Write a protein that binds this ligand. Structure first.
Ligand SMILES: NS(=O)(=O)c1ccc(/N=N/c2ccc(O)[nH]c2=O)cc1
Length: 294
C-alpha cells in the first residue's frame, strides 16, 4: 500500500512474504504479510476474519485484513525476534530451564485458548513463535484449513517443513484434532532443551520413519486404529521404542514425563493443552526475561 512503508523483509511466512512495516499515517510498526488471481476464497475470508476475533496475550494480534490489487494483505502485531533466532543465538549456552518452562507454559495457555474456541494453529514451528523483551512468547502466522493451498510451500520457492508434523497427519488423516498442535509444541519443547531438532525429516516417509526410530513403530496396542489409516503400510519397518532418557537429556523427570504425554502416538491419549498446564513440571513456573540482542 501507500499506507505502509516496508522497512525490512522479515521472512517468507507459510502463505507468502512477511515485511516489517510502518503505518505512514499513525506511525505504528507492524508485520505485513503479503499474499499474491481470480477473486480468491470467500471461505478463507471467513476463517480468516475468525482469526481476528482471537484475543489472548500469547497470540499475535491480527490487526486488519486488506484485499486489494489482486492481493491479500494481513496486518499483524509486530514482535522483534522469533524462537528459531533465539535458539540459534543461545546454542552454545542453552536456554535456561525457567525460561524454557515459562515459554512452554505461555504457549500452552495460548493453545488452550485457541482450542477452546475450536481454532487450530496447524503450522507450529520455531519460526512461528515470537518473543519480546518482557519475557512473552506468542503464537504467530496461524495456518488455514485450506486458504490458498494447501501448497507444498509458503509459496514458490523454498523450505516446506515436516519436522513438527504429527504422525496422524503423515499417516493421511483427513480431520485434524487439536492434538496436532500439542505434538508440534512437544517437538519444539524437545528442541529448546537439546538445541537440536527432534525429528528433522528430509521427506514425508523419512519424517515418519525418524519418529518410528525414536518412539517405536506404532501398532494396534499403543494406537488403536493406526493400521487402518489411509497411508499406513503393513510393510513399515518394525522399530523398537528406544529409551526416552536418550531423547531429551539432561531434562528432569517432570519435563520428560510431560514431553512423553505430548508425544503420545494416539491423538486421543495425547495430553490436551489445558491438562498440560496442570502437569507437575509447572509447579515452580516463573516468568524470566530473555537477554535479547536486537
Ligand atoms: N530477526 S528474526 O529472525 O528473529 C525475526 C523473525 C520474525 C519477526 N517478525 N515476524 C512476525 C511474523 C508474524 C507476525 O504476525 N508478526 C511478526 O512480527 C521479527 C524478527
Amino acid at each position: 500500500m501507500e499506507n505502509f512503508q516496508k522497512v525490512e523483509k522479515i521472512g517468507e511466512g507459510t502463505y507468502g512474504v512477511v515485511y516489517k512495516a510502518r503505518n505512514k499515517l499513525t506511525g505504528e510498526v507492524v508485520a505485513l504479510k503479503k499474499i499474491r488471481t481470480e477473486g480468491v476464497p470467500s471461505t478463507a475470508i471467513r476463517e480468516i476474519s475468525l482469526l481476528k476475533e482471537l484475543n489472548h496475550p500469547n497470540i499475535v494480534k491480527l490487526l486488519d485484513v486488506i484485499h486489494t490489487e489482486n492481493k491479500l494483505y494481513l496486518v499483524f502485531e509486530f514482535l522483534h525476534q522469533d524462537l528459531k533466532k533465539f535458539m540459534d543465538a543461545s546454542a552454545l549456552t542453552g536456554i535456561p530451564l525457567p525460561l524454557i518452562k515459562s515459554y512452554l507454559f505461555q504457549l500452552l495457555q495460548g493453545l488452550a485458548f485457541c482450542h477452546s474456541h475450536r481454532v487450530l494453529h496447524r503450522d507450529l514451528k520455531p519460526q512461528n513463535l515470537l518473543i519480546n523483551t518482557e519475557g512473552a512468547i506468542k503464537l504467530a502466522d496461524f495456518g488455514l484449513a485450506r486458504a490458498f493451498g494447501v501448497p507444498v510451500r509458503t509459496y514458490t520457492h523454498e523450505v516446506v517443513t515436516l519436522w513438527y508434523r504429527a504422525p496422524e497427519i503423515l499417516l493421511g488423516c483427513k480431520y485434524y484434532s487439536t492434538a496436532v498442535d500439542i505434538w508440534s509444541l512437544g517437538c519444539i519443547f524437545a528442541e529448546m532443551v537439546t538445541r537440536r531438532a527432534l525429528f528433522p525429516g528430509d521427506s514425508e516417509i523419512d519424517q515418519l520413519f525418524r519418529i518410528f526410530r525414536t518412539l517405536g513403530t506404532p501398532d494396534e496396542v499403543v494406537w488403536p486404529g493406526v493400521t487402518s489409516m489411509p497411508d499406513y503400510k503393513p510393510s513399515f519397518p518394525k522399530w523398537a521404542r528406544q529409551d526416552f532418557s536418550k531423547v531429551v537429556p539432561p531434562l528432569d523427570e517432570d519435563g520428560r514425563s510431560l514431553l512423553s504425554q505430548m508425544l503420545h502416538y494416539d491423538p486421543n491419549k495425547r495430553i490436551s493443552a489445558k491438562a498440560a498446564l496442570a502437569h507437575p513440571f509447572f509447579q515452580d513456573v516463573t516468568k524470566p526475561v530473555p537477554h535479547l540482542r536486537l
